[PDB]
Amino acid sequence: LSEQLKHCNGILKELLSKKHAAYAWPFYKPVDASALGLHDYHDIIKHPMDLSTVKRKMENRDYRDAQEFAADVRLMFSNCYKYNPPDHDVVAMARKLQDVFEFRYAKMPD
Ligand SMILES: COc1ccc(CCc2nc3cc(-c4c(C)noc4C)ccc3n2C[C@H](C)N2CCOCC2)cc1Cl
């Protein structure tokens, strides 16, 4: 639905909003592995994803349905849970942002 894609865009805007910036910020841009010294990142993560990429895809009308959008958002979180030890600060931030996402995604119009 166009309606469902608008709900997805609303979620995306919320994830990027000041309200959630304290825990969303690591997810704003692609992981710069070389800059961070994470020289194994691209050997472990096959499909990098981040909120700027989700935004560009939405703006370019790449997503054809809500589930395609959701798969990229969940991919972003899964990459974080795969790469980082579960006690890492960034994983705590991911869990909080994923809670924001999942509870609002569940309110999808249908
Ligand atoms: C110009 O504005 C910026 C400022 C900072 C960044 C990227 C910084 C960054 N971006 C990061 C992305 C990750 C990350 C994520 C998210 N998922 O796996 C990894 C690795 C991890 C660290 C990242 N870090 C380092 C920081 C200091 N984190 C360390 C760990 O605890 C949370 C804070 C990018 C931009 Cl564009």
Side-chain angles (χ1 to χ4, degrees):
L1 282 65
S2 188
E3 190 177 21
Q4 290 189 345
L5 288 171
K6 298 279 193 175
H7 182 70
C8 291
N9 195 49
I11 293 169
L12 177 60
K13 284 294 328 280
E14 177 169 2
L15 298 181
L16 293 164
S17 72
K18 189 54 168 170
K19 180 157 91 181
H20 302 301
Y23 37 95
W25 70 262
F27 307 98
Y28 285 170
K29 290 298 200 311
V31 174
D32 187 338
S34 298
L36 296 167
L38 308 178
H39 300 298
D40 57 350
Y41 188 79
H42 296 290
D43 301 282
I44 292 163
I45 299 306
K46 183 178 180 184
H47 297 294
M49 187 53 57
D50 69 283
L51 296 169
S52 75
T53 299
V54 175
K55 183 178 172 281
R56 193 174 63 254
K57 289 177 72 171
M58 189 66 76
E59 288 167 351
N60 297 345
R61 303 189 70 177
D62 196 311
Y63 300 118
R64 292 197 67 222
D65 51 62
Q67 287 289 108
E68 196 186 350
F69 164 85
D72 273 353
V73 177
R74 290 171 173 147
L75 173 62
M76 179 186 80
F77 294 127
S78 297
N79 289 342
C80 185
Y81 308 144
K82 183 179 188 184
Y83 182 78
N84 299 284
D87 66 332
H88 195 299
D89 294 340
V90 75
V91 171
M93 296 162 86
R95 291 198 197 87
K96 290 167 65 178
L97 197 66
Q98 184 156 20
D99 187 88
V100 173
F101 170 73
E102 295 294 343
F103 277 79
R104 193 164 173 197
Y105 190 77
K107 302 181 183 311
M108 189 67 60
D110 69 7

